[PDB]
Write a protein that binds this ligand. Structure first.
Ligand SMILES: CC(=O)N[C@@H]1[C@@H](O)[C@H](O[C@@H]2O[C@H](CO)[C@H](O)[C@H](O[C@@H]3O[C@H](CO)[C@@H](O[C@@H]4O[C@H](CO)[C@H](O)[C@H](O)[C@H]4O)[C@H](O)[C@H]3NC(C)=O)[C@H]2O)[C@@H](CO)O[C@H]1O
Length: 142
């Protein structure tokens, strides 16, 4: 799949073939300095946002933490919070998601940050969305 270059936020975009085991999705961009305190990358089924298999949600709030969660039929599940903030307001980042059989692995700036065990079947994910306090340079697929 060809990369999305400079896509405007809020973005959604199709993932050709959907998520498969071993797929790596790179989101390269910049956290805005003064344009809010949260952003999210969502791996979801379709364009509606009611079914998000993996919501990855850094929050520059309450000391800095990242929320990982799943939305199913419009309902959010129990949050998994990583109380580390690997991003910095105003700074560029490279975020890479590795789809594995049991979990997503998430690397930030070349370092494994968190894993998230699948709560719903990943093959059903065919869409990536990004919203919030970020500007995107590219989203690429291998
Ligand atoms: C202590 C505790 O449990 N705290 C709870 C809060 O964490 C919780 O806040 C919600 O948490 C979930 C994750 O669990 C999400 O981050 C909710 O944020 C919403 O996220 C969605 C998906 O990114 C986003 O919807 C998208 O918006 C874009 C436009 O930007 C477009 O419309 C898309 O189609 C759509 O999917 C939505 O805007 C966003 N809202 C906010 C306010 O950030 C987050 O609210 C709350 C409420 O569930 O419960 C506390 O108890």
């Amino acid at each position: 799949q060809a990369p999305y270059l400079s896509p405007a936020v809020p973005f959604s975009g199709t993932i050709q073939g959907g998520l498969q085991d071993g797929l790596q999705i790179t989101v390269n961009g910049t956290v805005l300095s003064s344009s809010g305190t949260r952003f999210a990358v969502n791996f979801q089924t379709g364009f509606s946002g009611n079914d998000i298999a993996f919501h990855f949600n850094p929050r520059f709030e309450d000391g800095g933490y990242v929320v990982c969660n799943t939305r199913q039929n419009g309902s959010w599940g129990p949050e998994e919070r990583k109380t580390h903030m690997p991003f910095q307001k105003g700074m560029p980042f490279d975020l890479c998601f590795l789809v594995q059989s049991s979990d997503f692995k998430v690397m930030v700036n070349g370092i494994l940050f968190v894993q998230y065990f699948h709560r719903v079947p990943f093959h059903r994910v065919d869409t990536i969305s990004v919203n919030g306090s970020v500007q995107l340079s590219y989203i690429s697929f291998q």
